[PDB]
């Protein structure tokens, strides 16, 4: 489980209403929940088992002729051209995304919302209710605090600094 102490290799923590996850540096893709790597742009014979997207790898398919495809990892399904958990295949959250609830033996796909929104118990726990979420990210690098960027919490340079953060 991703925590506020998780180191995101080639990435960084982001926070939503109900969970934390790792987000990759520009043009990188998730090969694991804590690991980002470069992505192949086209699966071919020299790119088998190499990353081609978030939680997807290149596979060879023996046939006439031989074919190559980008395949989601185990437990993930291709939905709107992105690999998401199979428990989330039918979950639409609105102002948020679907994550895995593992608090019961039977896992379920539930919604985690953009900052300012929380799951609405009166609306299938979709992200249709206004609610506050306090940031918990430890942003211990030089001149950066927790900032809400495109509806998610992340560590970002303080007001007046740019990328380490410099004036």
């Amino acid at each position: 489980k991703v925590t506020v102490d998780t180191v995101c290799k080639r990435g960084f923590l982001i926070q939503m209403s109900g969970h934390l996850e790792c987000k990759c540096e520009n043009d990188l893709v998730l090969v694991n929940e804590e690991t980002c790597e470069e992505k192949v742009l086209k699966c071919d014979e020299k790119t088998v088992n190499k990353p081609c997207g978030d939680f997807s790898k290149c596979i060879k398919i023996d046939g006439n002729p031989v074919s190559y495809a980008c395949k989601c990892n185990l437990g993930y399904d291709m939905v709107n051209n992105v690999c998401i958990p199979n428990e989330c295949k039918q979950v639409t959250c609105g102002n948020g995304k679907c994550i895995l609830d593992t608090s019961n033996p039977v896992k379920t796909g539930v919604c985690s919302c953009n900052i300012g929104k929380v799951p609405n118990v009166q609306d299938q726990n979709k992200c249709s209710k206004d609610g506050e979420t306090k940031c918990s990210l430890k942003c211990l690098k030089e001149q950066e605090t927790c900032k809400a960027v495109d509806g998610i919490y992340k560590c970002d340079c303080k007001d007046g600094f740019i990328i380490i953060c410099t004036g």
Partner: antibody
Amino acid sequence: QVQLVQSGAEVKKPGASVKVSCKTSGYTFTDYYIHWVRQAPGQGLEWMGWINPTDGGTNYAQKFQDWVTMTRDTSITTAYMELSRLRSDGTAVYFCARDRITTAAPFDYWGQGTLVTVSS
Amino acid sequence: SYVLTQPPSVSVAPGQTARITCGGSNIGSKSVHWYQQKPGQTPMLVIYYDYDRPSGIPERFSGSNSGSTATLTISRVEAGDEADYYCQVWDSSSDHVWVFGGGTTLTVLG
């Protein structure tokens, strides 16, 4: 441990009403829907509807909209289903079941069922 | 109305493999759940979200879902697997209902 405990068997006359209960325990009541499923003898499972424990909101299958009323008591984490104007051929077993409040969550726990026999 | 179509009966000998189909319009885009009901007993989840398996369910139970058919596969069938099996999906459309299949009776010839 999650438990859904339904009330005992019922015997009713045609045209009468009956109110079956589903006592829940072992989990946060307001996080899961309570569904009711009807099963006539020798027949298949039939979803009737759900209740939302937080606001008492209900969602019924159209065929049960007219004679089924679902309620709940949050203080004792119990769900209720009231059948009205029972038909003489309406003997059936009724199950309660839960699933996470979200889209398309599976029914992971079920009550043991309640037989309602209809005879004049 | 959205409909799930199951065969009424499947018969297998012990040790054989049983397959139970669940047909539906674009069922591959829906999350399919499977329930086992032994005679006179409470329905019980055996497969959820197409192919996830609850703890206690043996590995020989497996599910798949693609196109218009979701399938429950039971390898090395045992006498204890004799039961009715129901598939289930949520209809995201305006009708806004849960749907059960007609049920499949699995006979294990002992």
